[PDB]
Amino acid sequence: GSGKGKGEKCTSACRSEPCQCGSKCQCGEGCTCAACKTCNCTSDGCKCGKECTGPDSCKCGSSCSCK
Ligand SMILES: [Cd+2]
Ligand SMILES: [Cd+2]
Ligand SMILES: [Cd+2]
Ligand SMILES: [Cd+2]
Ligand SMILES: [Cd+2]
Ligand SMILES: [Cd+2]
């Protein structure tokens, strides 16, 4: 049942639709919302070292090397 929803570190912007984090993002790790989450690590392997391969499994809540 888990996997649907937002995290505690989500913004009031991410909790709006559409995602208002386009100009106001501060979401933490508990956010798999690709609307505000972006990543540079590729599917062949993690590049930053947080063990992530894209926003689909990016633990990083921005402000990281792969950001
Ligand atoms: Cd969020
Ligand atoms: Cd979002
Ligand atoms: Cd956000
Ligand atoms: Cd990474
Ligand atoms: Cd990442
Ligand atoms: Cd990272």
Describe the model.
The protein is mostly loops and 67 residues long. It has one domain. Helices cover 0% and strands 0% of the residues. It has no helices and no strands. The termini are far apart. Bound molecules: cadmium ion (6 copies). This is Cadmium-metallothionein. Cd(2+) 2 binds at residues 14, 19, 33, 36. Cd(2+) 4 binds at residues 39, 52, 58, 66. Cd(2+) 1 binds at residues 10, 14, 27, 31. Cd(2+) 5 binds at residues 41, 46, 48, 52.
Identify the overall geometry: globular
Bound molecules: cadmium ion
The description of the largest β-sheet is: none
The structural class is: little secondary structure
Number of strand segments: 0
Distance between the termini: 30 Å
**What percentage of residues falls in helices of 4 or more residues?**
under 10%
Radius of gyration, whole Å: 12 Å
Beta-strand residue fraction? under 5%
Number of domains: 1
Number of H- or I-type helical stretches: 0
Function: The metallothioneins are involved in the cellular sequestration of toxic metal ions and regulation of essential trace elements. Binds almost exclusively cadmium.
GO molecular function: metal ion binding
Family: Belongs to the metallothionein superfamily. Type 2 family.
Binding site for Cd(2+) 6: 48, 60, 64, 66
